[PDB]
Amino acid sequence: IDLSSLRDPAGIFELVEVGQVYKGRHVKTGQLAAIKVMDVTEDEEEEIKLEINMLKKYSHHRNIATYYGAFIKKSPPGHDDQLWLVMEFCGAGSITDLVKNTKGNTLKEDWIAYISREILRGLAHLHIHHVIHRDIKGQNVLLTENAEVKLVDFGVSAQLDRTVGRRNTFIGTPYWMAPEVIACDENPDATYDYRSDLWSCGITAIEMAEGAPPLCDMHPMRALFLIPRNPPPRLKSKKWSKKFFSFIEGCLVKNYMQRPSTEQLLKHPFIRDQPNERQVRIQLKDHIDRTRK
Amino acid sequence: SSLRDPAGIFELVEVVGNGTYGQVYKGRHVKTGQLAAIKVMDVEINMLKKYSHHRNIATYYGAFIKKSPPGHDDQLWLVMEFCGAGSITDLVKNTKGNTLKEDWIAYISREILRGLAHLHIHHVIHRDIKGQNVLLTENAEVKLVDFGVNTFIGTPYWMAPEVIACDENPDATYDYRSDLWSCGITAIEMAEGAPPLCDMHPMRALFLIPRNPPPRLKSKKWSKKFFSFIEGCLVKNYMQRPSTEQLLKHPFIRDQPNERQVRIQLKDHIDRTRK
Numbered sequence: 001i002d003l004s005s006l007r008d009p010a011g012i013f014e015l016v017e018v019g020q021v022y023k024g025r026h027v028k029t030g031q032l033a034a035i036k037v038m039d040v041t042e043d044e045e046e047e048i049k050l051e052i053n054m055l056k057k058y059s060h061h062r063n064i065a066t067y068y069g070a071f072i073k074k075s076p077p078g079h080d081d082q083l084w085l086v087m088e089f090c091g092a093g094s095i096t097d098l099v100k101n102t103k104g105n106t107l108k109e110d111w112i113a114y115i116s117r118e119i120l121r122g123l124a125h126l127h128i129h130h131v132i133h134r135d136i137k138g139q140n141v142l143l144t145e146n147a148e149v150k151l152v153d154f155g156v157s158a159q160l161d162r163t164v165g166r167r168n169t170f171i172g173t174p175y176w177m178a179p180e181v182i183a184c185d186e187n188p189d190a191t192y193d194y195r196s197d198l199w200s201c202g203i204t205a206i207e208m209a210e211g212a213p214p215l216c217d218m219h220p221m222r223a224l225f226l227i228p229r230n231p232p233p234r235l236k237s238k239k240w241s242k243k244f245f246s247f248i249e250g251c252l253v254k255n256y257m258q259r260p261s262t263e264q265l266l267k268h269p270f271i272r273d274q275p276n277e278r279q280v281r282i283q284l285k286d287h288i289d290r291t292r293k
Numbered sequence: 294s295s296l297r298d299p300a301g302i303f304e305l306v307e308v309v310g311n312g313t314y315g316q317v318y319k320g321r322h323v324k325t326g327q328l329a330a331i332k333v334m335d336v337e338i339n340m341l342k343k344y345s346h347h348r349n350i351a352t353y354y355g356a357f358i359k360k361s362p363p364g365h366d367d368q369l370w371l372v373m374e375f376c377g378a379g380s381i382t383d384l385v386k387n388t389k390g391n392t393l394k395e396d397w398i399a400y401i402s403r404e405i406l407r408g409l410a411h412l413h414i415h416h417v418i419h420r421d422i423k424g425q426n427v428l429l430t431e432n433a434e435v436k437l438v439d440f441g442v443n444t445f446i447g448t449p450y451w452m453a454p455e456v457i458a459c460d461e462n463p464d465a466t467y468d469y470r471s472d473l474w475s476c477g478i479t480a481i482e483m484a485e486g487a488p489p490l491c492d493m494h495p496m497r498a499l500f501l502i503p504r505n506p507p508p509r510l511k512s513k514k515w516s517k518k519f520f521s522f523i524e525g526c527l528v529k530n531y532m533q534r535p536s537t538e539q540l541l542k543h544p545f546i547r548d549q550p551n552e553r554q555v556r557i558q559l560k561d562h563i564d565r566t567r568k
């Protein structure tokens with residue numbers, strides 16, 4: 001295993017069934033793995049090498065779907081090669097899937113507290129190693145069959161899955177984007193900071209509570225204009241606890257300079273005080289099981 | 294509700310063209326072997342139905358629903374004419390020097406504009422004109438794809454200034470003339486191999502388009518008519534931008550003496566690129 005290299009995947013990883021996300025396996029162990037396969041030009045291969053040097057290293061962590069490495073499956077000369085980004089497998093789907101299947105498209109507050117803490121613990125690990133995730137959203141928060149919460153990592157340190165295959169030219173979905181990452185009249189140069197992940201975490205908590213991020217009903221281009229202008233988003237319903245409202249307001253501080261860090265939000269009462277944690281963990285494991293059958 | 298299953302009628306071959314369009318496949322009509330493009334969506338049809346009957350718009354064939362087990366999300370299939378010779382972005386990328394001959398640009402730009410004129414006369418704005426949505430057939434016919442147009446913002450480089458919301462323009466005013474700005478950027482893309490601001494971060498380009506003066510061709514080699522055409526498409530304030538009809542009369546578009554040879558040169562280029 002090497003994360004500073006760019007070898008052919010043959011004899012290391014192979015694809016089993018469905019850049020597109022594929023189910024794959026480590027040849028020698030038989031361990032399942034999610035593999036992102038992208039078409040790369042023979043010129044984009046030189047861009048990968050530079051981005052691989054930009055990679056920051058960090059250990060395994062229980063809240064991060066481990067990034068195993070990058071590989072290039074070479075095609076005949078002239079023909080577009082294949083970039084493979086290999087990551088640990090999470091079989092119970094995303095948090096967006098979880099909230100979508102449930103009745104009323106809303107999760108119980110103690111489920112949001114549990115999932116949000118796992119997201120933050122994963123983020124704390126990335127931030128302490130000087131890495132910004134940059135794409136926190138319910139789709140990138142996965143569940144294992146054992147109700148373990150893991151952040152998608154296809155080489156987040158150098159954003160290997162967002163910089164090649166003409167993907168780099170796409171703006172993407174704007175709804176989880178922090179105000180500072182949106183270039184507007186007062187912010188001409190986008191400023192990605194570790195705290196941009198915390199804004200995304202707050203939008204993910206709203207998404208778990210309501211089934212969709214704020215401004216979901218708007219055209220992405222309109223939402224992109226409104227995020228840096230609108231006051232921080234709020235939960236629509238008054239049903240929620242005072243701690244949950246407080247948590248949202250904590251993440252969603254408009255000016256990133258004044259937004260708390262991961263450690264400070266990990267101490268927030270909504271995250272810190274989870275009396276029914278054991279039952280939540282059981283309720284989630286049970287929800288995953290009955291959804292499978 | 295009367296949409297049938299595609300089995301035995303259309304089959305998916307492969308993704309076209311490796312993520313750039315999303316879930317769009319090169320399909321095949323089972324009984325004839327005739328190729329088709331199929332837009333597969335997880336489940337705006339009559340838009341592609343009556344507005345695609347024009348030689349410069351890829352023709353709509355039909356709609357199908359591939360039924361999944363109860364509870365599991367079904368698949369809508371939208372089938373249209375396949376354009377086998379790739380996009381004009383592919384064309385310029387696959388040309389030596391990443392630039393097309395001016396008479397090729399004149400020809401392709403006229404076909405884009407004729408497709409746009411058809412859409413605009415029916416009160417339809419394409420909204421996503423770019424080299425990647427302008428396709429070639431094997432016999433060098435030019436066809437527009439992806440009109441209508443939901444949560445993903447694509448590439449910003451071909452977007453007109455008025456379509457980008459800012460302090461003075463809070464509500465992005467999509468107008469038929471926004472497609473003409475996109476056609477001018479497509480002509481620059483054919484001339485240089487990339488749109489203006491290509492070297493910038495898409496988010497930075499989105500900030501600069503409504504602020505920057507109209508883009509210009511970098512080289513002085515081009516004819517005065519071609520410079521005039523670019524200036525016509527790229528008028529900053531859409532209120533003074535010409536209509537599709539006015540640009541169709543522009544000398545660069547209207548006066549094409551070597552049209553027959555261009556068509557032959559394009560057919561020949563498509564063939565050499567295939568092998």
Ligand SMILES: Nc1ncnc2ccc(-c3cc(F)cc(NC(=O)CN4CCCC4)c3)cc12
Pocket residue numbers: 309310314315316317330332351371373374375376377428438439440442443445
């Ligand atoms: N006719 C053809 N022949 C050959 N290659 C073709 C390649 C692409 C297409 C095509 C057809 C179509 F309906 C829509 C789109 N584009 C998108 O779906 C983009 N969406 C914007 C919002 C979500 C994604 C592309 C037709 C082809």
Ligand SMILES: [Mg+2]
Pocket residue numbers: 345346347348349350351352353
């Ligand atoms: Mg047609």
